Every structure is written in structure tokens, then in C-alpha cells.
């Protein structure tokens, strides 16, 4: 919608962001091409933009960035050799050609696993050429997550750069740098899983359920706004999500900019925490708004019992506009409880809808739904207590031993799941507790909700491949709102037959003394799951003693001169003593 599309986007983004967004885009489309080849492609597109910035009437400056990036994909000589069918996409005319490329993006490309180099090597290269160090970082991540939103990844690179600038100028760099890198890698993987789950849930459960989720979250974010303003923001927010899932980078960035412009031009009627966000730049504004803290809940709100319990003309409004009346109930309840999780608010709204659906059809509706608010209390106290109990357990045991507590609990919950899946789930949940128990209780539940939603979905899609547990399949075949309580409601499997003993499962060698602290813990936790599977009726006292004996067994044999004999003699004694202690 401009005279020169490439010259305008270059001015809005600047040279810094333009180069990075083009680098991320090429790596996501052409995942198998080397790094230096993408660099030469970025500098060609970047230098062409500078011609249009100096004269918008120059050659090819009138063309949109889609067709300029499109035929630039068709300029590579190996197009058909590396990506067979893709070269035939180029015979199609835009827009029919850009959608042809989105098909070819490989979600799981055959590339080597990223091995983190030593701190000395990474920073001797970070100071050698700082811009090249960040470009390779973007190149290797973008071609392994082709659907990762590019400006989102661009913000990780800035945080990735701020760590190397700070950490590697301080003595004992690893104590500063490595925890910052592992923290990001976890948040980056969580961001990738969240972006994918937002799209998958939008298409699986329908646009109505997606809108209901946004109503609860935006009402928590913007409690001073009106239902008409919140309901409109939900429609536009869903419009942006529907467009952003299509895969187009520029279309998704433009819609995010439009919504950011509307919210910034109506601050006095939305929320008061946006004066700082609305002076940010084009890519920083939408990201800033999506992370804005909740505005102050208004003062002296009326009780929800008036418009939803203590009113004769209530069932009529439910039949007047069901989704609008329920939407008002979601809006009024969410704005007053920013400490509740969105899924929790959806349970209450679903419970309220289920009550009215049966109450109005009865003889006396008012006396039927008179105690509908009593049904909400057992649904609110359950997640409140669950978080409080586990945060006290985490504060007592620390992250590692807290994972071991979740390990035994879930392996006794469903022992049919494969061992690496239970370890991955229990470790990520321990990370969630380590991430959210730091916050006050008014922020613990919203903090844990987004992380727990993907963690249980990873378990579901992993267990979907090889179904072994009928209980896990049942809890996974539930609503996203009912999926979490389904797992927590499960008790220990009484009919689980213990698996036979395997010596190689509990046998350990001198190689365990060379891995890092993380992989070494993972090996103990893997044996902990297998120990529970073999003796599921074992008590917590009997398992804590074996785990404590395991720590001394690994600690002794790693400090010994003859580590080979130590792991063989002590392990042969440790297993025989543990097997005799349990029975």
C-alpha cells in the first residue's frame, strides 16, 4: 500500500532489523543451505533496498517484498537439487507461489544437534566478529524452527547478545554465562511450543473456544475497560492469530502493528500501563503490549451475584444471547480475579453455563441456580492448594530433589509411560516450580498456566505416538480446560504388574563421571523411574534411602583411583542391598 514497499519497510525497521529479518526468513525457507550463502543473499537484498531508499522510482522498487523475496528464492542454483519440488513452485505467480513455499518448510530437518562450545571458544569468537557471532546464532535456530515468529526470535538474539557482553567480561565466566544460556534455551523452546499450540488449539477446538480464552486473559490484563472494548479486542486479537498462523511474516507483523496502533490510540479506555509501551519502535511495540502487567482492578466492584444470581430476569438473558451473556460472565469474573488462571476461569464459566442449561428448563429456575456460586469453591480451592503444597515442597527440597518427588509421583501415577517421557515431564515441571514459586501466590497460577499447558501437551503428543497407558490417553482426550485436573485426579495404579529386574538397567560405569551436572542428574533420575517401575509399592522412605545411597555410590566411585572396579563392586553391592531392602 506504498510507493516502494521495500524502501518503506527498510525505513521502519532500520538496517539492523531488516538484515536480521531477511536472514531469519531465508534460513527458514532454505534450511539446508550453508551460512555464508545466506549471508550473500541478505547483503544482496539489503543493498537493493538502499537503492530504493535513495530513489523509489529505481528498477524493481515498485515490486512488493513478497515477489522480491520470492524470485530471490528462485535465484539459487541448487534449488531443485537440494529442495526437489520447490523449483516448480517458481513457475507459479504470486500470491499462489508464496503459499507453495510454506508447504516445503520441514518441521524436522535432518541437521546435526547443536553442541554448545566451551565458554572460552564462544567468547573468543564473540569478540572476533560480534555481528557474525549473532548472525550464525540466528541462522542455526531459524532453520531448525521454520515457523518461529521472526521478530520474536530477533528479541532473543538481543538477550543472547546482552549476556555475552556482560558475562564474558567477568571472572569465572561460566558461572555467569551458562545459567543465562540454559535459561534462554528453555524459554526459547517454551516460546516455540506456545506459538505452535496457539495455532493447533485454534483449529482443533474452534474459534469460539479461542475467543473465550482471550476474553478471560484480556479482562485480567485490562480490567478498567468495558466489555464492548474487550470483546472487540478479542475479535482483532483472534484475527491476528489466525493470520499469524498462516506463516506469512510480513502479514503477521502488519496485523500486530495495526492492533498495537489501536490499543495505543485508546489508552484512556483500555488500560494505564501502556504509556511506556506506546513510545517503543515498530517491532518492540506489539511485543511490549503483549507482556504488559495487569492494570489496577477498579475500585468497589459490585458483586457478581446481582447480575447473575440475584435477578429474576436472568434465564431470559441467557436465552437472549448465550455467548454474549456467558462472555459478560467471563469478563466480569476475570477482571476481578487476575490471580486465577485462564483455564480456571473457563471451568467456572463452563460450570455456570451447565447450571443454567439445566436450571431454566425446570419449574423454579431462581431456586435452582440459587447456589451456583457454591459449585465454584471446590474448583478454585483445588488449584490454589495444589500450587501452595508443591511450592512448599520445592522450597524444602530444591529443584533437583523436587523433580525426584514428581518422578515417583507420576511413575506411580501411570507406570506404563516410557521412562524418558516421565523424566522429561518431571524435570520440566520442576523447572515450572522453580520459575513460578518465586512469585507471590497472586501471580503463581497465571505464571504456571502457560508452561503447564505445553508440558502436558508434549506428554500427550509424545504418548500419542505409542499409546501404552489407557489412563493417559483418556486424560489427553479431554478439553484443554479439563486436561490438567484429569491428570492430578489420578491415583496410584493398583493393577500395574511390576516389570522384571534388569541388571543392565541399574548398572553404571566410569563414563558417568565425565558428563556435566545436568546429564549426570538425568542418568540418576532415569534409574529412579526404572526403580519405581520395578517396585511400585515402595514407600517414599525406602526410595529416599536408595536415592541417597546412589549419591554416595556415584560420589565415591568418581573420586576413586580405580573407577572401573568401584562402579562394578559397589554397584553389585548397591543393587543387591536395595533389592533385598524392598523385597
Amino acid at each position, epitope marked *: 500500500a506504498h510507493k516502494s514497499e521495500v524502501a518503506h519497510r527498510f525505513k521502519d525497521l532500520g538496517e539492523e532489523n531488516f538484515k536480521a529479518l531477511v536472514l531469519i526468513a531465508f534460513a527458514q525457507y532454505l534450511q539446508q543451505c550453508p551460512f555464508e550463502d545466506h549471508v550473500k543473499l541478505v547483503n544482496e537484498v539489503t543493498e537493493f533496498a538502499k537503492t530504493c531508499v535513495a530513489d523509489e522510482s529505481a528498477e524493481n522498487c515498485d515490486k512488493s517484498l513478497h515477489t522480491l523475496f520470492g524470485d530471490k528464492l528462485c535465484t539459487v542454483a541448487t534449488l531443485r537439487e537440494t529442495y526437489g519440488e520447490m523449483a516448480d513452485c517458481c513457475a507459479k505467480q504470486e500470491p499462489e507461489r508464496n503459499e507453495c513455499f510454506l508447504q516445503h518448510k520441514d518441521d524436522n530437518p535432518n541437521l546435526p544437534r547443536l553442541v554448545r562450545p566451551e565458554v572460552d571458544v564462544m567468547c573468543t569468537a564473540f569478540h572476533d566478529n560480534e555481528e557474525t557471532f549473532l548472525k550464525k546464532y540466528l541462522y542455526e535456530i531459524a532453520r531448525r524452527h521454520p515457523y518461529f515468529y521472526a521478530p520474536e526470535l530477533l528479541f532473543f538474539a538481543k538477550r543472547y547478545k546482552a549476556a555475552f557482553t556482560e558475562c564474558c567480561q567477568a571472572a569465572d565466566k561460566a558461572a555467569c554465562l551458562l545459567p543465562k544460556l540454559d535459561e534462554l534455551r528453555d524459554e526459547g523452546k517454551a516460546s516455540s511450543a506456545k506459538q505452535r499450540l496457539k495455532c493447533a488449539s485454534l483449529q482443533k477446538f474452534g474459534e469460539r473456544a479461542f475467543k473465550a480464552w482471550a476474553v478471560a486473559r484480556l479482562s485480567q490484563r485490562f480490567p478498567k475497560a468495558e466489555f464492548a472494548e474487550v470483546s472487540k479486542l478479542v475479535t482483532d486479537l483472534t484475527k491476528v492469530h489466525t493470520e499469524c498462523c498462516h506463516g506469512d511474516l510480513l502479514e503477521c507483523a502488519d496485523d500486530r502493528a495495526d492492533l498495537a496502533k489501536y490499543i495505543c490510540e485508546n489508552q484512556d479506555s483500555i488500560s494505564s500501563k501502556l504509556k511506556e509501551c506506546c513510545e517503543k519502535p515498530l517491532l518492540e511495540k506489539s511485543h511490549c503490549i503483549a507482556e504488559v502487567e495487569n492494570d489496577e482492578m477498579p475500585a468497589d466492584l459490585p458483586s457478581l451475584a446481582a447480575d447473575f444470581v440475584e435477578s429474576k430476569d436472568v434465564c431470559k438473558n441467557y436465552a437472549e444471547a448465550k455467548d454474549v451473556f456467558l462472555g459478560m460472565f467471563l469478563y466480569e469474573y476475570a477482571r476481578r480475579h487476575p490471580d486465577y488462571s485462564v483455564v480456571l476461569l473457563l471451568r467456572l464459566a463452563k460450570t455456570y453455563e451447565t447450571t443454567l442449561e439445566k436450571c431454566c428448563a425446570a419449574a423454579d429456575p431462581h431456586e435452582c441456580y440459587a447456589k451456583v456460586f457454591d459449585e465454584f469453591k471446590p474448583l478454585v480451592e483445588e488449584p490454589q492448594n495444589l500450587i501452595k503444597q508443591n511450592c512448599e515442597l520445592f522450597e524444602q527440597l530444591g529443584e533437583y530433589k523436587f523433580q525426584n518427588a514428581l518422578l515417583v509421583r507420576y511413575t506411580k501415577k501411570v507406570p506404563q509411560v516410557s521412562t524418558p517421557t516421565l523424566v522429561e515431564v518431571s524435570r520440566n515441571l520442576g523447572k515450572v516450580g522453580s520459575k513460578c514459586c518465586k512469585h507471590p501466590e497472586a501471580k503463581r497460577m497465571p505464571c504456571a498456566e502457560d508452561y503447564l499447558s505445553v508440558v502436558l501437551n508434549q506428554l500427550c503428543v509424545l504418548h500419542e505416538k505409542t499409546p501404552v497407558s489407557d489412563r493417559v490417553t483418556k486424560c489427553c482426550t479431554e478439553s484443554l480446560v479439563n486436561r490438567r485436573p484429569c491428570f492430578s485426579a489420578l491415583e496410584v495404579d493398583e493393577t500395574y504388574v511390576p516389570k522384571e529386574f534388569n541388571a543392565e538397567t541399574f548398572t553404571f560405569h566410569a563414563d558417568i563421571c565425565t558428563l556435566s551436572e545436568k546429564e549426570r542428574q538425568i542418568k540418576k533420575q532415569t534409574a529412579l523411574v526404572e526403580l519405581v517401575k520395578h517396585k511400585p509399592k515402595a514407600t517414599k522412605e525406602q526410595l529416599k534411602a536408595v536415592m541417597d545411597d546412589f549419591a554416595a555410590f556415584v560420589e565415591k*566411585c568418581c573420586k576413586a583411583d*580405580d573407577k*572401573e572396579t568401584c562402579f562394578a563392586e559397589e554397584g553389585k553391592k548397591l543393587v543387591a542391598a536395595s533389592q533385598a531392602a524392598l523385597g
Partner: nanobody
Amino acid sequence: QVQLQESGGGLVQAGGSLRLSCAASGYISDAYYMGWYRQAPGKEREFVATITHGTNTYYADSVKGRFTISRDNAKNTVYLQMNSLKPEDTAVYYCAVLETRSYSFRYWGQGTQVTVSS
């Protein structure tokens, strides 16, 4: 203390056999156990085989199934049987005496040389 001396090493060909002996000049108590280490050219010291209790044998992965270790408790001599020798086995072979509870070195040998040639 007690001295250790290795005997039986030399020049052998690939696929051949060789027997290494290691006699101690003193009584090896029921505590201490004896084993074998090797040091390839340009490589650090490496575990080979060890024996304790008189029947418990523990070998390294590269030599498992090819080397066999045994001890004559009354003769104060540990035996290392080598079969299906490979050129990678060319190293200086030491026999050592170690404590059981601590698994630490106590007595080192002089070291006999074994060279496997194609």
C-alpha cells in the same frame, strides 16, 4: 614393602596369543586385589583387567572377550591371558595392587612391554 615384577611380554603378531605373569615378593592379603593397566604410545594410562575375591573378574570393553585374568593366591602371582591380539594393544602393561574399600593404588609394577605387529 612388596615389589612386583612382570614377565612374559615382548613382540607378538596380530591374532596371536601372549601370557603375562606378575609375581609379588610378599603375601597378598585377602583385602588387596590385583589387576592390569596399559599405556599406549602417546596415550594416557588405561584400565585393562582386574580380579578380586578370587573369582570376580572385571575387564575393559576394548579387551572384553579377548583377555582373561586369573590369580594364584598361594603363588602370589596374577596371570593375564591375551588372545586375538590387535595392533591397538601395543602398550606398556603394568600390574598393580589396590585397596578394596578405597579402590586406590598401593603397589605399582615396573611394566612389561607388549607390541602387536601386523
